[PDB]
Copies of this chain bind each other. A is one copy, B any other.
Amino acid sequence: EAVTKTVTIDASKYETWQYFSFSKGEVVNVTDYKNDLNWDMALHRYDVRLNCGESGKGKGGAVFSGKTEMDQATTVPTDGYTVDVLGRITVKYEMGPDGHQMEYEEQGFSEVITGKKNAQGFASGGWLEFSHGPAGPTYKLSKRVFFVRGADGNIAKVQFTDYQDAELKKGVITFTYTYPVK
C-alpha cells in the first residue's frame, strides 16, 4: 500500500510557494491556498507549510519522529500533529551596495518541519540548520524524519535530503516521502 518516492522541487523564488500533492505525486497549482484541500505540503526557499492551522483549512499537521533514519521511524502517531502557526517569511531578496535587502510578511508555516527562526531570522530545529559564518551562509541537513498529515488526513513519512540541486543551485529542495502510512 505505502509507496516510497523522492521529489525535487525548485523553491528558489522568494515571492511564491510551490504546492505539492502527496496522492498526485506532483506540484499542483494553487491560487487560494487557505481555501483549497488539493495540496498537502508547500515549499518556499527552506520554509515548509502544511494544509492546516494558519495556512489552511485541511487536516494537516506534523510531528518529529525522534529519528534521523526513515526505517527506524516505524510507529505512526495517531495524534499530536502540530498545526501551522504565523511566522516571518522572506518575500523579497536583493543584493546591492548595502548587502542583501529583504522584505517580509507574516504567514503560516510548519514550525515543526521548518524549524523556529531566531532574532536575526536563522531557522533551526527542523529539516535544515541554517546559519552564517563571518561572511555568508552555512547549511546542515538534520535528516529529521517527520510524520506529516496531508489535507485529507492521510499521513506521509517525510525526510528532506537536499537543499540544492546537482549544480549547487540553492533553494532546490529534495525529499523522500513514504505514503500513505498507517
Residues on the B chain within 8 Å of A136, using CB: 95-100, 135
Residues on the B chain within 8 Å of A95, using CB: 136-137
Q: Are B96 and A133 in contact (CB under 8 A)?
A: yes
Main secondary structure of the interface of A (DSSP, over half): strand
Partner among B94, B99, B122 whose Cβ is within 8 Å of the Cβ of A98: B99
0/1 interface trace, chain A 126-147, chain B, CB 8 Å (1 if under) = 0000011111111000000000
Question: What is the total number of residues of chain A having a CB less than 8 Å from a CB of chain B?
Answer: 23
0/1 interface trace, chain A 106-129, chain B, CB 8 Å (1 if under) = 000000000000111010100000
Q: Are B134 and A98 in contact (CB under 8 A)?
A: yes
- Residue A168 at the chain B interface, CB threshold 8 Å: yes
- Residue A72 at the chain B interface, CB threshold 8 Å: no
- Residue A101 at the chain B interface, CB threshold 8 Å: yes
Q: Are A96 and B168 in contact (CB under 8 A)?
A: no
Q: Are B97 and A134 in contact (CB under 8 A)?
A: yes
With A119-B122, A120-B120, A124-B119 as contacts: A99 and B133 at CB distance below 8 Å: yes
Please name the 4 residue pairs, one residue from A and one from B, whose CB atoms are nearest each other, closest first: A97-B133, A99-B134, A135-B135, A99-B135
Interface residues of A (CB under 8 A from B): 94-102, 118-120, 122, 124, 131-138, 168
